[PDB]
């Protein structure tokens, strides 16, 4: 399995440090130059920094210049990203990517999943999970769980444990004025379904180490 | 590199999405596909070429100061947003598009109005939020008011909107009011009112306290 993971993202207070790192499995990590790439949430793609296979050469985008220092151990097949003097500009998924030089230029050709750096003084706060209980037409039920008062991003949300997937929607969180994350998950069922068929979001906020089993009954 | 935000595309039909830059015709431009919660995924490079396991349906060009994304015989599983990319020698940096939106055309549907009184678990803890769904409509635009034994409510509202649906092309939206526990117990009527380009006149989703 050819594959990038990176780890070290988190909440830190503005002006503080993180380092990132980026493990590479199934190929040839000294062959390739890496680079890390970043997206603010509900924004575009940003290219950071890269670092060629010996690490003679690096390049960064001035809006990083000094502040982040990239790095990488082939022995370890791991990239690396110091970040210092963070600030909400910074605020981004990271991602690890692989260079691919094809005849005519250069491109990404491998992506990690990427790893959430929160840039802020909030303190950690795992949710309050509420049932949206059903109580109907034309055969349909709705039913769903309110995820409240959060910090940081994300949640995850499953029904029954993953079981159930047709008719779900999770929708993207909503930022309250009190700077806490709230989303809701929905799904819709057979109304016939509602008086045997036992319905539980399962909710994981893995910075909080929350996890939730919350059964939805009418 | 400039992009349209937004391309709109029926089924089957022909998508082309745009790069613009000085002489962009000049170097290579490659392109990526990033589904939501996903890392973006190269599916033309070196302008017009296709890594192995894309679909020849997905096609480039490139010329003077515009390279183009084609993507043909387009499916609901295309909507995603698209970026494309160069390296800028002369400053010696990868440079993004600003991407664009693909969202698939479809037929008007209805939204399936549901809503939800708040929990007594939640009002155990001082705070009541009264959510009003809107399932499986389209287009994207709607409008959502909300009515506290008619009384009309303004500042206390905040909504959600999915994605469009990869499957069904649709959008799901919640709306969800929020009072205290206080101000809650003092109301009867709580009712929603949508507004739709598929509802011949809104449709109003309310609840009796109790
Ligand atoms: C790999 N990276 C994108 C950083 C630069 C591309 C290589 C630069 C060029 N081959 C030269 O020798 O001038």
């Known amino acids: 399995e050819v594959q990038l993971v990176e780890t070290g993202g988190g909440v830190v207070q503005p002006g503080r440090s993180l380092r990132l790192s980026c493990t590479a499995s199934?190929?040839?990590?000294?062959?390739?130059?890496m680079s890390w790439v970043r997206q603010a949430p509900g924004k575009g793609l940003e290219w950071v920094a890269d670092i060629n296979p010996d690490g003679i050469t690096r390049y960064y985008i001035d809006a990083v210049k000094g502040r982040f220092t990239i790095s990488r151990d082939n022995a370890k097949s791991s990239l690396y990203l110091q970040m210092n003097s963070l600030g909400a500009e910074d605020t981004a998924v990271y991602y690890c990517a692989r260079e691919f030089h094809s005849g005519l230029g250069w491109h990404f050709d491998l992506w990690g999943r990427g790893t959430l750096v929160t840039v802020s003084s909030a303190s950690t706060k795992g949710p309050s999970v509420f049932p949206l209980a059903p109580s109907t037409s034309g055969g349909t039920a709705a039913l769903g769980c309110l995820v409240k008062d959060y910090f940081p991003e994300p949640v995850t949300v499953s029904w029954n444990s993953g079981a159930l997937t047709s008719g779900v929607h999770t929708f993207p969180a909503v930022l309250q004025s009190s700077g806490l994350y709230s989303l809701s998950s929905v799904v819709t069922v057979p109304s016939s379904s509602l008086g045997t068929q036992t319905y539980i979001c399962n909710v994981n906020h893995k910075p909080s180490n929350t996890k939730v089993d919350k059964k939805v009954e009418p | 590199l400039t992009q349209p935000p937004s391309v709109s595309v029926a089924p089957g039909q022909t998508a082309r999405i745009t790069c613009g830059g000085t002489?962009?015709?000049?170097?290579?431009v490659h392109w990526y596909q990033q589904r939501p919660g996903q890392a973006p995924l190269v599916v033309v490079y070196?302008?017009?070429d296709r890594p192995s396991g894309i679909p020849e349906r997905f096609s480039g060009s490139n010329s003077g100061n515009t390279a183009t994304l084609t993507i043909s015989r387009v499916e609901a599983g295309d909507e995603a947003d698209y970026y494309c990319?160069?390296?800028?020698?002369?400053?010696?940096?990868?440079?993004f598009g600003t991407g664009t939106k693909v969202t698939v055309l479809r037929t008007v549907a209805a939204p399936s109005v549901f809503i939800f009184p708040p929990s007594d678990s939640q009002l155990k803890s001082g705070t009541a939020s009264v959510v009003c769904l809107l399932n499986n409509f389209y287009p994207r635009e709607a409008k959502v008011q909300w009515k506290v034994d008619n009384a009309l409510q303004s500042g206390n509202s905040q909504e959600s909107v999915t994605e469009q649906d990869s499957k069904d092309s649709t959008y799901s939206l919640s709306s969800t009011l929020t009072l205290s526990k206080a101000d809650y117990e003092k109301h009867k009527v709580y009712a929603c009112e949508v507004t739709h380009q598929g509802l011949s006149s809104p449709v109003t989703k309310s609840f009796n306290r109790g």
């Open positions: 990319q160069v390296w800028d020698d002369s400053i010696n940096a990868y440079v």
């Open positions: 002489n962009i015709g000049d170097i290579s």
């Open positions: 070196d302008d017009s």
């Open positions: 199934g190929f040839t990590f000294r062959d390739y130059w």
